[PDB]
Write a protein that binds this DNA or RNA. Structure first.
Lengths: 851, 123, 981
DNA sequence: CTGGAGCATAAGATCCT
DNA sequence: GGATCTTATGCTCCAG
């Protein structure tokens, strides 16, 4: 874990750079790109200078690629300017000019890079795979005309319907009964196995045999229950147990209930009193017969068709949708990723590796903490050896939060075990030194913070520029962390959230009033500026709880906006508003429909005006004439001109901006009219367009097309942002009330702890479920690190004695299963007093709390 | 079978696709006697006359040797009431059957129930 | 195949082959051999003998014998062996020693505008030039030679003297030292050219002028019009003409600090302008406004003289048409759209392509109905737009979602359910025309009793259409040779299309496209069969390829993409699609091409052509130039950079000039300043009558705000019904249960059989298939049977009575159906709704005011029960008189009463222990939390807040309207809670 | 016009030493 | 001093 400098970084062989939060990943990637372009560093450099055509830099996000390409082009330009001027003010470029040998050839190389720079190898993984396949079509075995198709959900649903139709219809009533009890329909099946189907099909722990069928499984279960029913109906009728003070002598009711539970072997349910054959229950109330454990061993094993049906679906529908997509000629992102993986796994994979190594003898993967095992296998099989071909992996495992999306941290674990070079960075630009010291204390309060020694948190030092950052609220200064313990010692989640939301709105309104009167200063040395509503921000995990805090903020007259808006624009009132307007202008003769469309909030009229309009025959005739002319201009010149004419004639573009809150509605109308226009570009007919609009209203699609845009940057208000969309950004003042909360996981899907594979389990293994809980706690730790590092000046989370078990005040609180509880209580069940002591143990003039 | 006959009847534009597909859906692939009888009944419903006697069906032979192509099995099928009562598309009204036959008359069940409704209303 | 040199092709093809891969490979190989023959035919000449050319990369070892076998095969067929590559050289040898004018040759020829010709063609013109007169019109932006340099013996030949037309001769300045020093480089081309614009963009032009100057039989003159350095665009043209450099670099501190050596720029120049826009819609809006701006400013300008260039025409043209049609008449300017996708009769083209996808379609009902939506098919099979609504409702309620026939179903390895198919639906339609719903099933099919009248011929016509579709989907499945494919096109078009006036253009186009394709197939003499998939996507590929370069100079503004080999001078030129990654249009080669692995002087790529087009587009401007690109995507407000070409141009502008104010500050300050300078972005009248029907009171109170809309101002928000689903319902949710649930309930109220009613639904095709419907049926049986025993034991035979009262001076008329002597017994399978007990509460008072001693009871599912005691006549009217007042109050004003959410609020506050209202804030705190939970729904249930009636009156809830809804509810919701038992 | 969730519960309520 | 036992009540994501 040597301290890293781009001046002395060895540009040879496999690497792994741990660039933490605010370490300038863009700055380092740009500097090392300049280093590879110039061939600088001497012994640590590549043996030859490289053209810009032979530099592969793949990055996760398309916007990240665009911004990175722009910044590196700017670096090329200003570096060539500094080389031609032989002087500069940037210390990096000054020492780079000290390191470069020949100014003339360096400047000519930079000119050639700048002119060839438009076609530099900077892609997303999906585009990069497609481009290599289009190059080596013969080696890849793929076609030539393929498109981008994103709606695999419909095809997955169709494949699920196909599987349910052809493997579940001729089954009898009793098998249908148990499968219907365990799940209702193909919608339920898709909702169960969608996350398993997406990505790569994982490894199933103890797969069922191929030849096992539903009828044979049902025969096994019915035999297994009728044997023990026969055994107990034979051996019924004797007593041995201890009649205790707790063990009542009227316990023969359970035996009589079992005797009446002897009914039939075609049922499925069993008695609660059947569980009283436990010798450990006898310890509260002498086995003497093997039945006392035969009942127990049959009870202790779960019996279902669930494993077999899940395995059949996951083995059939994937190849079914793959074959149907191949026949249709469509392609998916994971589909051609798997195509490249299979082509590399084939016997021509060595030829592919040779061709790719000769074309790009370098690759610089950005954001490695969110990568896929298929991607890592491709990278290993292509560039794992054969030097004169370098490979530099750059990532940051502490900010990998897309496991539900399909990421893996154990893939990074395997890569880190496979690579030798490890480095880190110190200059945390974005944060205050108080924040740096605070996060060092919080992640050093307990050894083994991440529950892994293989991902160690290295403390960092803030930049000397930002040492003057100090926070002032109402006169005196404030510590960098200031937690909040409410007026309670053990509380439920509802009143818990409501009270931190209420106090949150309290300090937010105090801070904004103080900034309005000039007392809450976000000040830097002698510089001092007030705090505004866009300066304060709050993080939250889920949208309903975001709405929960939003309700309190909008009740206390702080305007609030939710900048992780996943809602479609088709769900708001404007979509069906456009529906009645289009239906009324299609047939303007229907008085009832025309009146209904005219009486809405689209116009802005009043009930007295409508009532007077119902009687004025001449006014009715002239508005019929107006909408008839609108029908003429519709069927003559398309969709938007009638809308433009209608708004311009009605002055509603003025009226909605005059009325408060109408801007949001009006920009929704503009967006939906635009999207309606490129829908009607293909949809030449008008009734077809109406049917399409109705279909899209009845189906709330959640693609990127119908997402509502941000309202306005001119207006300033507090922003509610989710934790995932806050990745890679900054916020002056953050608020984290809800990270003390947690959620226990239950689904059986875990990763191998030594061999690093994804294990799909269908049983109730305690090792499986508690490994799942441990890695879920590691995930919550990673979100905690991300949330704490995304601050700038002052971060103030909420300390809470949260409880999930029904016992509210039992002495031992239930905070121990959250990230905050794990890093504060060291792994010990605590009380409110212990919480107070554990807080004040680390409290020294930088971390504190108030009621 | 006589599907080419029914489609050249379509192409002659003398009768209706309504009656053609009605005959197909009430005959299926069973006896050609039943098919042609249902075709004529559906046609006569196609103009809109509420009844039809059996004498018309056994005495017209519109544009084809209907009797010669309808005789198919053992015995003789001039007994049209038996030939149609053997089919499940014609019955005496005790069952939800398309064609009614009790008093030497064959027509739709809708017309039969409406006719008997107004008959017992007047009587 | 299998020559031990086609191993990778065998690997590619032998995995799977439905001739699609073969078709793609044939098209790409034909394109590559066309490029080979037109550019570098020496390789073909060597391949004819059977050898390769050294220095060439991979894949030549199979690209050569493929061409050898191709020429051998086409010689074996009896076709002519003559072509361009083996005739041009013999043409040269024949022409170089002959007479002056062999007969048939034209007197003279002309070439204008062409800036890229093959070297073989230029050699042919060079040899042809010794006979006739040929004029070459090339437009190079500079005057002096800016080309490359080959060898020292070649620069000696470069002293050819270029005359003018009449007066004297002229060439590049400083003859000796330019060729002496490093200007003409020892191996590389010229690098001291000055202008980096030319140096980076004239890649094609440099090799072109080098090839043109390399002809020994040349006669080169020039007519170079000078340019006046007055504005920015003319200064740029002068700098690109005279081949100099004006970019300041800061050689020392003095040069870096002093900034007067450039030319100052007019602060009000409107020639070259840069713009940044968020969306293309706003971009074209700004373009329209600025277009109207300089059209207003310059009277000596016409829209005919102005052009607009786009990167991708398809992504921009709807915006162009939309804004220029929505432009008002007083601000109108004409527009002409060219080079876009030739889309003439798009519905009939879509119908034809979907028809060619017949033998593999699953026959979605919505898909086939959208196919039927074509008016040509509608007129051919005499089904009218009036009949479309009938057919939509019939195929909705009969529930047709899946394929046409059981054979079609079983061909896709699926169980023949015999239901939800098109044949099933037509059978249900005709049996419903024959029968009645009360009769029941006939062949396990329920009869659909809506279609009974004269309107029944539409489904017969639809059945004829579906029979034709089944016949043709059986016909088109088999793969046959092209001789069998010859007449099926004509048969298809006449069978499924009625030739009308609008149809004839598409008729002729489809016929000639198919005829051309099968004519190519006949000319090449295919022998084997071919599946329909190759013909379909080849028709698609030859139908989408045809653009329209027709309307160019009609008089409106010109909208066209930057087509290669097209540079025409105008006054104002606008640029669109200058974003990063989209322009220049990148296109990776075919991979196995040898031109990318070995270049030459006569190279032409898409990127080079785009750069050359942009450079002569900059040349083409005379008065104004407009630059625009998307810089800030409004979604995430991320920063997006412009293209490399425009970035280089704006950097040159920044490094070449300075604002007149800040003369000598710094080069960086000057360029930042000029970059900032060039970049910009209610009481109502009502009187209560004395006659009120009881149903009017019933319809009023069930939803107060809805009743306000739907009779007073006669407004109902009757939106369209939901779209037909794509799948058979495997599960039943929503309103689908309620109709099935209620009719099952009424069977057990009379204690009649339910097995008959079960098979009736089983014939109707609404239940899930197999035992699943039966299992779901059992769950509904065991829940109604629990509910039935509660109803049956309290049920006595009653009868209806007519009610006629008079309260508040208002007569009340109506009917009270099926009341037994102990009171009212009603049942409805739902939950305890406030309006539900209220609905019987209205019926209870009218029975109790007109005598009639007896309490009223209500039974529901999940053990719910509403029960109200009876009162005397005087107390019954007293509550009713207030409720009659609630009508005329609600009639005039939209009374703020939530039915259920108001009831949920008052349930907590009202206490039956003291039989009064509470006022303690702790219980009032519970009421507010319960109100929002009653107003806004849970994760799955729909709250009363999401209602279109309530959404019109307000969008948010204020604390004063919070109490206002409560206060009006508390007046009218007191009798239900105070009398509940 | 109409229709809407399950599951783990502990306090209390009686049955029984 | 032990139970069963039926209710009120709690609580159920993230992104292309």
């Amino acid at each position: 874990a040597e301290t890293l400098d781009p001046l002395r970084l060895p540009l040879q062989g496999e690497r792994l750079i741990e660039a933490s939060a605010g370490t300038g990943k863009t700055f380092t990637i740009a500097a090392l790109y300049l280093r590879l372009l110039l061939g600088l560093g001497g012994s640590a450099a590549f043996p030859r200078p490289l053209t810009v055509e032979e530099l592969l830099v793949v990055t996760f996000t398309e916007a990240a690629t665009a911004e990175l390409r722009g910044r590196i082009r700017s670096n090329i330009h200003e570096l060539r300017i500094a080389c031609l001027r032989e002087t500069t003010d940037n210390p990096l470029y000054e020492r780079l000019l000290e390191e470069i040998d020949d100014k003339a050839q360096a400047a000519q190389w930079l000119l050639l890079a700048e002119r060839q720079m438009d076609e530099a190898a900077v892609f997303t993984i999906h585009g990069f795979c497609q481009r290599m396949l289009n190059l080596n079509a013969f080696e890849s075995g793929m076609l030539f005309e393929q498109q981008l198709i994103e709606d695999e959900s419909l095809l997955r649903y169709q494949a699920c319907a196909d599987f349910w139709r052809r493997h579940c219809y001729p089954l009898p009533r009793e098998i249908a009964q148990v499968v219907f009890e365990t799940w209702k329909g193909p919608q339920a099946l898709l909702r169960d196995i969608n996350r398993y189907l997406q990505g790569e099909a994982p490894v199933i722990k103890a797969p069922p045999p191929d030849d096992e069928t539903l009828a044979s499984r049902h025969a096994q279960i019915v035999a297994r229950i009728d044997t023990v029913k026969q055994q107990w109906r034979d051996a019924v009728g004797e007593l041995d147990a201890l009649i205790e003070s707790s063990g009542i002598d009227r316990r023969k009711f359970n035996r009589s209930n079992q005797a009446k539970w002897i009914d039939k072997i075609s049922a499925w349910a069993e008695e609660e009193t059947n569980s009283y054959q436990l010798p450990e229950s006898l310890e509260k109330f002498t086995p003497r017969h093997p039945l006392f454990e035969a009942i127990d061993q049959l009870l202790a094993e779960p019996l279902s068709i669930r494993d077999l049906v899940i395995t059949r679906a996951l083995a059939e529908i994937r190849e079914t949708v793959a074959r149907e997509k191949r026949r249709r000629g469509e392609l998916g992102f994971d589909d051609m990723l798997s195509r490249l993986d299979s082509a590399l796994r084939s016997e021509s994979g060595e030829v592919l590796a040779a061709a790719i190594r000769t074309r790009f003898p370098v690759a610089m993967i950005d954001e490695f903490q969110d990568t896929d095992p298929q991607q890592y296998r491709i990278f290993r099989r292509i560039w794992h050896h054969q030097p004169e071909t370098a490979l530099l992996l750059i990532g940051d495992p502490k900010q990998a939060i897309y496991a539900f999306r399909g990421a893996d941290i154990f893939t990074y674990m395997k890569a880190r075990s496979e690579v030798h070079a490890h480095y880190t960075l110190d200059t945390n630009w974005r944060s205050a030194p108080g924040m740096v010291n605070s996060v060092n204390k919080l992640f050093s309060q307990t050894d083994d913070a991440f529950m892994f020694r293989e991902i160690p948190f290295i403390p960092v030092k803030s930049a000397g520029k930002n040492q003057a950052l100090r926070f002032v609220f109402k006169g005196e200064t404030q510590p960098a962390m200031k937690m909040w313990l409410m007026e309670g010692e053990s509380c439920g989640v509802g009143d818990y959230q409501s009270t931190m939301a209420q106090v949150c709105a309290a300090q937010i309104r105090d801070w904004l009033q103080a900034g309005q009167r000039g007392e809450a200063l976000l000040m830097n040395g002698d510089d001092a500026r007030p705090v505004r509503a866009s300066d304060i921000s709050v993080l939250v995990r889920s949208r309903q709880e975001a709405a929960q805090v939003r309700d309190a903020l909008t009740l206390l007259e702080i305007p609030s906006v939710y900048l992780s808006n996943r809602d479609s624009v088709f769900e708001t009132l404007e979509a069906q508003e456009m529906l009645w307007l289009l239906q009324a202008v299609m047939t303007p003769e229907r008085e009832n429909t025309l009146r209904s469309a005219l009486a809405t909030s689209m116009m802005g009229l009043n009930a007295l005006d409508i009532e007077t309009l119902n009687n004025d025959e001449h006014a009715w005739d002239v508005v019929v004439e107006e909408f008839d002319g609108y029908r003429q201009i519709w069927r003559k010149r398309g969709v938007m001109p009638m809308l433009r004419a209608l708004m311009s004639a009605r002055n509603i573009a003025e009226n909605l901006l005059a009325t408060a809150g109408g801007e949001r509605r009006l920009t929704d109308i503009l967006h939906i009219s635009e999207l309606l226009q490129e829908a009607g570009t293909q949809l030449e007919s008008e009734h077809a367009l109406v049917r399409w609009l109705s279909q899209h209203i009845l189906e709330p699609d959640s693609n990127a097309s119908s997402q509502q845009m941000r309202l306005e940057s001119d207006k300033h208000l507090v922003q509610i942002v989710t934790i995932h969309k806050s990745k890679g950004l900054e916020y002056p003042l953050v608020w984290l009330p809800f990270i003390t909360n947690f959620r226990v996981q239950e689904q059986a899907f875990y990763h191998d702890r030594h061999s690093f594979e994804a294990v799909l389990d269908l049983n109730a293994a305690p090792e499986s479920v508690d490994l799942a809980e441990a890695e879920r706690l590691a995930e919550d730790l990673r979100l905690l690190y991300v949330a704490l590092t995304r601050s700038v000046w002052h971060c103030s989370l909420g300390v809470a004695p949260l409880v999930r078990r029904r016992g509210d005040k039992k002495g031992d609180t239930d905070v121990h299963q959250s990230a905050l509880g794990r890093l504060l209580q060291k792994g010990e069940p605590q009380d409110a007093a212990g919480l107070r002591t554990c807080i004040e143990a680390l409290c020294d003039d930088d971390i504190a709390w108030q009621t | 079978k006589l599907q080419k006959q029914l489609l050249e009847a379509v192409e002659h534009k003398q009768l209706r696709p309504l009656d053609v597909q009605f005959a197909l859906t009430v005959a299926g692939d069973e006896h050609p006697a039943v098919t042609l009888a249902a075709a004529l009944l559906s046609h006569d419903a196609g103009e809109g006359h509420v009844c039809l006697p059996l004498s018309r069906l056994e005495n017209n032979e519109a544009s084809h040797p209907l009797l010669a192509t309808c005789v198919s099995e053992i015995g003789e099928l001039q007994n049209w009431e038996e030939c149609l009562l053997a089919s499940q598309a014609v019955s005496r009204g005790d069952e939800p059957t398309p064609m009614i036959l009790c008093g030497d008359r064959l027509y739709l069940n809708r017309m039969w129930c409406n006719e008997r409704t107004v008959a017992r209303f007047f009587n | 195949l299998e020559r031990e040199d086609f191993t990778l092709l065998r690997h590619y093809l032998t995995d799977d082959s439905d001739k699609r891969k073969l078709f793609q490979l044939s098209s790409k190989a034909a394109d590559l051999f066309d490029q080979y023959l037109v550019y570098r035919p020496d390789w073909l000449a060597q391949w004819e003998t059977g050898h390769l050319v050294e220095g060439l990369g991979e894949a030549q070892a199979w690209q050569a014998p493929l061409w050898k076998a191709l020429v051998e095969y086409t010689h074996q067929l009896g076709q002519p062996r003559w072509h361009r590559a083996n005739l041009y050289q013999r043409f040269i040898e024949t022409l170089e020693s002959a007479t002056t004018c062999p007969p048939g040759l034209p007197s003279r020829v002309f070439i204008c505008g062409i800036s890229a010709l093959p070297p073989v063609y230029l050699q042919a013109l060079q040899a042809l030039g010794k006979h006739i007169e040929i004029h070459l019109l090339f437009t190079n932006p500079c005057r002096y030679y800016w080309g490359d340099i080959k060898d020292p013996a070649y620069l000696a030949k470069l002293l050819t003297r270029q005359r003018r037309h009449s007066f004297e001769d002229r060439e590049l300045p400083l003859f000796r030292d330019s060729e002496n020093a490093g200007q003409l480089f020892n191996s590389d081309g010229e690098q001291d050219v000055g202008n980096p614009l030319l140096a980076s963009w004239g890649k094609l032009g440099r090799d072109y002028i080098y090839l043109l100057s390399d002809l020994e039989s040349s006669q080169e003159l020039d007519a170079f019009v000078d340019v006046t350095p007055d504005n920015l665009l003319h200064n740029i043209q002068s700098d690109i003409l005279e081949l100099e450099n004006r970019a300041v670099a800061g050689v020392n501190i003095e040069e870096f600090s002093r900034s007067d050596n450039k030319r100052p720029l007019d602060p009000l120049d409107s020639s070259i302008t840069f713009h940044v826009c968020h969306s293309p819609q706003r971009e074209v809006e700004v373009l329209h406004d600025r277009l109207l701006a300089m059209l207003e400013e310059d009277p000596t300008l016409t829209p005919r003289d102005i052009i607009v260039m786009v990167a991708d025409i398809d992504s921009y043209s709807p915006f162009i048409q939309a804004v220029f049609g929505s432009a008002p008449a007083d601000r109108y300017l004409p527009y002409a759209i060219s080079d876009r996708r030739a889309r003439q009769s798009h519905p009939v083209l879509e119908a034809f392509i979907s028809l060619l996808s017949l033998p593999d379609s699953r026959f979605v009902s919505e898909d086939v109905l959208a196919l039927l939506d074509v008016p040509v098919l509608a007129a051919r099979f005499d089904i009218t737009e009036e009949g479309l609504r009938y057919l939509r409702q019939w195929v909705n309620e009969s529930g047709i979602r899946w394929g046409i026939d059981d054979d079609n179903v079983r061909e896709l390895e699926l169980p023949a359910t015999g239901q939800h198919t098109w044949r099933f639906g037509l059978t249900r339609m005709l049996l419903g025309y024959a029968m009645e719903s009360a009769q029941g099933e006939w062949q396990s099919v329920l009869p659909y009793d809506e279609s009974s009248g004269l309107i029944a011929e539409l489904v017969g016509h639809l059945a004829s259409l579906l029979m034709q579709l089944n016949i043709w989907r059986r016909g088109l499945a088999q793969e046959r040779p092209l001789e069998e494919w010859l007449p099926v096109c004509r048969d298809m078009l006449n069978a499924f299309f009625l030739p009308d006036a609008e149809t004839e253009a598409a008729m002729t186009l489809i016929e000639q496209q198919w005829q051309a394709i099968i004519a190519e197939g006949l000319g090449a003499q295919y022998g084997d069969a071919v599946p329909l998939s190759l013909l379909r996507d080849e028709l698609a590929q030859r139908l989408d390829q045809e653009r329209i370069s027709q309307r160019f100079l009609a008089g409106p503004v010109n909208i066209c993409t930057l087509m290669p080999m097209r540079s025409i001078p105008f006054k104002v030129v606008c640029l669109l699609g200058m974003n990063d990654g989209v322009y220049p249009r990148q296109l990776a080669p075919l991979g196995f091409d040898l031109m990318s692995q070995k270049p030459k002087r006569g190279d032409r790529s898409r990127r080079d052509d785009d750069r050359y087009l942009f450079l002569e587009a900059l040349i083409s401007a005379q008065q104004k130039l407009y630059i625009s690109y998307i810089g800030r995507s409004i979604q995430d407000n991320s920063e997006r950079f412009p293209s490399v070409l425009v970035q280089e141009l704006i950097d040159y502008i920044g490094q070449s000039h300075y604002l007149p104010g800040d003369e000598a500050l710094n080069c960086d300050e000057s360029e930042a300043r000029v970059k900032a300078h060039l970049t910009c972005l209610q009481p109502l009248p009502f009187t209560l009558p004395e006659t009120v029907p009881l149903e009017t009171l019933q319809r009023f109170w069930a939803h107060p705000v809805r009743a306000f809309f739907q009779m007073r101002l006669q407004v109902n928000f009757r939106t369209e019904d939901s779209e037909i689903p794509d799948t058979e319902p495997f599960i039943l949710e929503g309103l689908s249960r309620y109709q099935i649930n209620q009719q099952l309930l009424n069977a057990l109220v009379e204690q009649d059989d339910a097995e008959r009613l079960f098979r009736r639904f089983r014939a109707a095709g609404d239940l899930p298939y197999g035992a699943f419907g039966e299992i779901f049926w059992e769950t509904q049986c065991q829940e109604m049977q629990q509910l039935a025993d509660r109803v049956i034991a309290c049920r006595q035979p009653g009868q209806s009575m007519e009610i006629d009262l008079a309260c508040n001076g208002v007569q009340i008329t109506g009917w009270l159906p099926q009341v037994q002597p102990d009171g009212l017994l009603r049942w409805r399978p739902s939950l305890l709704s406030v309006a539900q007990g209220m609905q019987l509460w209205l019926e209870h008072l009218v029975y109790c005011a007109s005598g009639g001693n007896g309490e009223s009871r209500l039974f529901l599912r999940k053990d719910g029960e509403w029960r109200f005691p009876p009162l005397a006549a005087e107390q019954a009217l007293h509550y009713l008189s207030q409720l009659i007042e609630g009508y005329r109050e609600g009639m005039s004003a939209p009374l703020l009463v939530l039915p259920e959410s108001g009831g949920a609020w008052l349930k907590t506050c009202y206490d039956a222990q003291n039989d009064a209202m509470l006022d303690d804030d702790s219980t009032l705190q519970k009421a507010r939390t319960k109100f929002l939970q009653a107003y806004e729904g849970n994760m799955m249930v729909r709250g009363e807040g999401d209602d279109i009636w309530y959404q019109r009156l307000w969008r948010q809830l204020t604390p004063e309207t919070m109490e206002a809804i409560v206060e009006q509810s508390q007046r009218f919701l007191l009798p239900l809670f105070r009398f509940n038992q």
